[PDB]
Amino acid sequence: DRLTVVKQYVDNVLNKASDTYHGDKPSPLLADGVDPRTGQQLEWIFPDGRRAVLSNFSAQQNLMRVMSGLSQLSGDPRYQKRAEDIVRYHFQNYQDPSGLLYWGGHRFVDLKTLQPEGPSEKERVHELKNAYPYYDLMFSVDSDATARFIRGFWNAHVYDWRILETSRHGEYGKPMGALWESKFEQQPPFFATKGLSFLNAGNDLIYSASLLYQHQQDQGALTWAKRLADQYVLPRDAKTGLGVYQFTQALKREEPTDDADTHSWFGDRAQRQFGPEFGPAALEGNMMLKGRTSTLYSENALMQLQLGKDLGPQGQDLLKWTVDGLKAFAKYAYNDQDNTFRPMIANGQDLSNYTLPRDGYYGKKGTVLKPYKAGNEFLISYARAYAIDNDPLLWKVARGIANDQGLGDIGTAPGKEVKVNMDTTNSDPYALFALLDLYHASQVADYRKLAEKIGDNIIKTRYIDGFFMASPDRQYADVDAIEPYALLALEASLRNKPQAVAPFLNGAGFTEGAYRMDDGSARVSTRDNELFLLNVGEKLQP
């Protein structure tokens, strides 16, 4: 059974990733990473050589959903109970008086000492970027503590409520301001602000406020969630409908002297690097480049499609704008000849094969911006958008991605001339999720049969030494792996209990800071993502 495999996997996590540092009185907390061969837990190395075991709860919210779903499908409540216990322990010990948790991009807990840590000295701050924590679980454990987190998050990350100047960073220990009662005055697109309104953090603000509305009927939270979503729609290009990654531009407070110094207070970084050749349209929010387009057309889209459906009638504008943007991205950026997206500016400018003429935020001089393959995360976006709006343009992208990914032909339309590859070797959990979405909307048996094949591939090739890994050579397994999440969604579908498993929004966590090299030097801006890419015998490079 796929269910038996996931049960064994979570048992393995609760064994090997657990607190082994406090004798017979362990905390319930878990290590983010485990070498599945030895059980060595993934460590962060601080400037004096001290090693902490990385326990970052924001990087365990897929695992929390896996544990809740496993308990729902198996009937064994022990996994749900442990997930609750971990949540409770964080509210009890790792929630500041302002409501913020010691988690996120720049804070975590050392499993050995159980103290909060700050791996980025200049950034001892709260940061969520495309995190999408499992607030449904948190509310069921402690609704007051969860609401305090969500309000404290907005309180710290909204720099100016009058104009909705937002920030990807928030300070700890701030007193509560006027919050949802703040007066608001809509500003024109790309107004200049100090705060950086990146949509990865914007995604987490919108999502959290929407969940506070869902659980506590907080109309202020909903008003500002929709208003913040609006902020990313208003500056979209009037002709193409493309964009945007942010709705403000950096306030220029100093004249730059070097292209390679890309600090935001020298002004919009895209205008510096592309302005001379491309004109005023070159703004950071308009740069439809790899990575940014995942935040916009994957993470933002999945969350807003589900939120739009949840809101019923007052969610119709959100659904329309979310689908409209996916149509714009398909119409301008997707190349059906080879399943690539073109790097672009939101005014419709193609940047395919453009050589950067100067250093800057988007690469060194001589960097070539290339079309990039459309991954299976976009197969999910276009599948779910098609279910809401059966536009052949959306189907075209889904069909192109699936074909490029070795899945065969999902058809000229749902159920029409379907020729899927039942011998596919694909083991991507994103493809499994997407096929389940195609199946749910169309009820075409071949889509779930293919999903079962991908599930079997995941177990055959990625279930290694009791953990899930993207390659058998990887040094560390991530306890937040989404392979078991996809397997549980498949089991839930086959058992006619899709609501047993939380909706997949493609959230994840990361930890970023200085990491000490063996020669004692500081490797700045090291991410745990990089540690999870290492194979056996590999080390981080300077």
Ligand SMILES: O=C(O)[C@H]1O[C@H](O[C@@H]2[C@H](O)[C@@H](O)[C@@H](O[C@@H]3[C@H](O)[C@@H](O)[C@@H](O[C@@H]4[C@H](O)[C@@H](O)[C@@H](O)O[C@@H]4C(=O)O)O[C@@H]3C(=O)O)O[C@@H]2C(=O)O)[C@H](O)[C@@H](O)[C@H]1O
């Ligand atoms: O591969 C990618 O392109 C990358 O895109 C996204 O990450 C973005 C940047 O690449 C990443 O470095 C970070 O940058 C911001 C800010 O733009 C940058 O200047 C820097 O901020 C400095 C300073 O480091 C801060 O401590 C503080 O002093 O403010 C300064 C400033 O310039 O204002 O670091 C910032 C940050 O860490 O947030 O984030 C960018 C983003 O868009 O989030 C993806 O997130 C990343 O995964 C990758 O795909």
